[PDB]
């Protein structure tokens, strides 16, 4: 059944699993027409498919050409997501295929179940967790490869950089969800916290800065402060 | 007009014949049901006064043989049996009629209700859903499970309704996942009508049989099958015009006959709301929508 606070350690066991987040697949800017009507212009999007144990990110870039001449795009976007996740699973060697796929949005369950009928032993699960994977496009290197794409493309990343050399996958996931939650709540402030000290850089082959263990504790505290502040404002409490 | 004689009535029981029902007292001199209309299937059904659990009964067609009911005190039920001796049977029926120990099938001349509920129902199709090949009549009860319910446990006692499953490889062509899931026309027209049922008459016959088992026996798997067969049509953008007009008539009479007090357990809110207000066919079932809105507006 649903993945929640009660069965959280299951994310870091030795059963291959992927999170699928479709919130950045269909992206638009809303604008006025010459006649003063409203129209949308699609921009490139992405499927966010993540192994929470290893940090492997399968970023399938959704180029605006896939929407051309299609109707009901927010509906189609769920089916295209499920088509591409199904294609990803079929492309993996059997021993690398997931035993479970956790969708961040319940509207993905039927599309993904129907595309995965050929894989009756892969469990398709919702989650009660409110995961901040929508903020993936606040990670500058991910935003850059999506916006520059001129055709459909899959790009592979490790969203944990080299953190698993020093920390467990539980701790890495908690750091990732804290970073993304901060970026989602107040992007400008979160990016200021991450880049404020010019001496700590991002390696060419990394997404995040090269913090020491002590610098990560300071950063994580600055992100928690950012989130609580913002919350008191949202709710006047 | 045919007759189903009863050897006796040793236990107090409510006896159904089609949409009619009669209370019989323990050892009441009751010897059966006469003037049964030829040309239709019929169902004779029972609910014991001392155990209002297990409604059970028999589907039959008096054109296929001479049938009677006899209580079995070992198995504790009224059983249907065939009398192969025509002269013995004619002589039993004539004696019971002369002594007026039989209830008359109480059909009003104007009243097409039973025809309307059984228009496409054939005894030869019933005998394939309910497998007991040594009898020409078919036993159904409240508890019998469907082949589909069993997959998700005695195979000989199952209702072999056609399995319908909207998230199955049978329902969904590789490469047409979104198309086939959102528009079930290929599943309805190619897989089910052309493939399995061969024609709309056999599909409607099964739909009508499932409804009648749901209504007469409170058979839950039958209710599931009735709703699945409605939803498969309503969820298809491409349905022949004759089938939609016929389905509207079928469902109108079903909704008309349903006891008002059983709408809560016999009608699925999701299916009916989706079929009447959201589906491709939301505007194709005028008669059904009008009777549902006037008889069961709470469900909607």
Swiss-Prot record, chain A:
Full-protein positions shown: 1836 to 2069 of 2413
Impact after mutating residue 105 to K: Severely impaired growth. Reduced growth at 30 degrees Celsius. Strongly reduced growth at 16 degrees Celsius
Domain remark in the UniProt entry: The MPN (JAB/Mov34) domain has structural similarity with deubiquitinating enzymes, but lacks the residues that would bind the catalytic metal ion.
Annotated localization: Nucleus
The organism's place on the tree of life at top rank: Eukaryota
Subunit structure and binding partners: Component of the U4/U6-U5 tri-snRNP complex composed of the U4, U6 and U5 snRNAs and at least PRP3, PRP4, PRP6, PRP8, PRP18, PRP31, PRP38, SNU13, SNU23, SNU66, SNU114, SPP381, SMB1, SMD1, SMD2, SMD3, SMX2, SMX3, LSM2, LSM3, LSM4, LSM5, LSM6, LSM7, LSM8, BRR2 and DIB1.
Function: Functions as a scaffold that mediates the ordered assembly of spliceosomal proteins and snRNAs. Required for association of BRR2 with the spliceosomal U5 snRNP, and the subsequent assembly of the U4/U6-U5 tri-snRNP complex. Functions as a scaffold that positions spliceosomal U2, U5 and U6 snRNAs at splice sites on pre-mRNA substrates, so that splicing can occur. Interacts with both the 5' and the 3' splice site, as well as the branch region. Has a role in branch site-3' splice site selection. Associates with the branch site-3' splice 3'-exon region. Also has a role in cell cycle.
Note: Present with 468 molecules/cell in log phase SD medium.
Region named RNase H homology domain: 7-237
Name of the protein described by the UniProt record: Pre-mRNA-splicing factor 8
UniProtKB/Swiss-Prot annotation, chain B:
CDD domains: Aar2_C (cd13778), Aar2_N (cd13777)
InterPro entries for this protein: AAR2, AAR2_C, AAR2_C_sf, Aar2_N, AAR2_N_sf
GO cellular component terms, A-Z: cytoplasm; U5 snRNP
Annotated GO biological process: spliceosomal snRNP assembly; spliceosomal tri-snRNP complex assembly
Subcellular localization: Cytoplasm; Nucleus
Phosphoprotein recorded as keyword: yes
PTM summary: Phosphorylated on serine and tyrosine residues.
UniProt entry keywords in alphabetical sequence: Cytoplasm, mRNA processing, mRNA splicing, Nucleus, Phosphoprotein
PTM sites of type Phosphothreonine: 257
Location of Phosphoserine modifications: 236
One Pfam match: AAR2
Misc. remarks from the entry: Present with 7330 molecules/cell in log phase SD medium.
Role summary: Component of the U5 snRNP complex that is required for spliceosome assembly and for pre-mRNA splicing. Involved in splicing pre-mRNA of the A1 cistron and other genes that are important for cell growth.
Assembly, per entry: Heterodimer. Interacts with PRP8 (via RNase H homology domain and MPN domain), competing with BRR2 for the same binding site. Component of a U5 snRNP complex that contains at least the U5 snRNA, PRP8, SNU114, AAR2, SMB1, SMD1, SMD2, SMD3, SME1, SMX2 and SMX3, but is not a component of the U4/U6-U5 tri-snRNP complex.
Family: Belongs to the AAR2 family.
The protein's name in its UniProt record: A1 cistron-splicing factor AAR2
Species whose genome carries this gene: Saccharomyces cerevisiae (strain ATCC 204508 / S288c) (Baker's yeast)
Lineage of origin: Eukaryota, Fungi, Dikarya, Ascomycota, Saccharomycotina
Name of the gene this protein is made from: AAR2
């Amino acid at each position: 059944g649903a993945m929640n606070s009660s069965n959280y350690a299951e994310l870091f066991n030795n059963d291959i699993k992927l999170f699928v987040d479709d919130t950045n697949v269909y992206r638009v800017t809303v604008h006025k027409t010459f006649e003063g009507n409203v129209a949308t212009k699609a921009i490139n999007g992405c499927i966010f498919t993540l192994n929470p144990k290893t940090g492997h990110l399968f970023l399938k870039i959704i180029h605006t050409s896939v929407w051309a001449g299609q109707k009901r795009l927010s509906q189609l976007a769920k089916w295209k997501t499920a088509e591409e996740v199904s294609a990803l699973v079929r492309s993996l060697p059997k021993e690398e295929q997931p035993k479970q796929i956790i969708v961040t949005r319940k509207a993905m369950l039927d599309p993904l179940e129907v595309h995965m009928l050929d894989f009756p032993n892969i469990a398709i699960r919702p989650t009660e967790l409110r995961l901040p994977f929508s903020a993936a496009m606040s990670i500058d290197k991910l935003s850059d490869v999506v916006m520059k794409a001129t055709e459909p493309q899959m790009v592979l990343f490790n969203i944990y950089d080299d953190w698993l050399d020093r920390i467990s996958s539980y701790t890495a996931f908690s750091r990732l969800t804290l970073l993304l939650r901060a970026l989602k709540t107040n992007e400008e402030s979160a990016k200021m916290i991450l880049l404020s000290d010019p001496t700590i850089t991002i390696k060419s082959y990394h997404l995040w800065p090269s913090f020491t263990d002590e610098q990560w504790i300071t950063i994580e505290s600055q992100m928690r402060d950012l989130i609580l502040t913002e919350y008191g404002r949202k709710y006047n409490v | 007009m045919n007759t189903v004689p009863f050897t006796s009535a040793p236990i107090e029981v409510t006896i159904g014949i089609d949409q009619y029902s009669f209370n019989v007292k323990e050892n009441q001199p009751f010897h059966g049901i006469k003037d049964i209309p030829i040309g239709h299937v019929h169902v004779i059904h029972f609910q014991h006064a001392d155990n209002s659990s297990m409604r059970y009964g028999y589907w039959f067609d008096c054109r296929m043989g001479n049938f009677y009911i006899q209580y079995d005190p070992k198995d504790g039920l009224y059983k249907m049996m065939e009398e192969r001796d025509g002269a013995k049977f004619e002589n039993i029926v004539h004696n019971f009629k002369e002594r007026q120990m039989m209830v008359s099938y109480p059909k009003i001349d104007e009243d097409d209700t039973w025809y309307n509920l059984t228009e496409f129902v054939q005894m030869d199709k019933i005998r394939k859903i309910v497998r007991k090949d040594e009898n020409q009549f078919s036993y159904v009860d409240s508890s019998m499970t469907t082949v589909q319910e069993n997959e998700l446990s005695d195979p000989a006692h199952s209702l072999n309704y056609t399995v319908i499953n909207f998230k199955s490889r049978e329902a969904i062509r590789p490469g047409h996942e979104m198309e086939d899931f959102l528009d079930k026309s290929y599943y309805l027209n190619t897989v089910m009508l052309q493939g399995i049922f061969k024609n709309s008459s056999n599909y409607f016959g099964e739909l009508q049989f499932a409804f009648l088992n749901a209504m007469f026996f409170g058979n839950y798997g039958s209710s599931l099958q009735w709703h699945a067969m409605i939803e498969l049509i309503c969820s298809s953008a491409t349905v022949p015009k004759h089938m939609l007009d016929k389905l509207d008539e079928i469902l109108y009479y079903q909704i008309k006959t349903l006891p008002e007090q059983y709408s809560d357990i016999l009608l699925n809110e999701r299916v009916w709301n989706i079929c009447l207000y959201s589906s491709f066919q939301k505007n194709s079932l005028h008669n059904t929508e009008k009777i549902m809105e006037n008889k069961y507006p709470e469900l909607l």
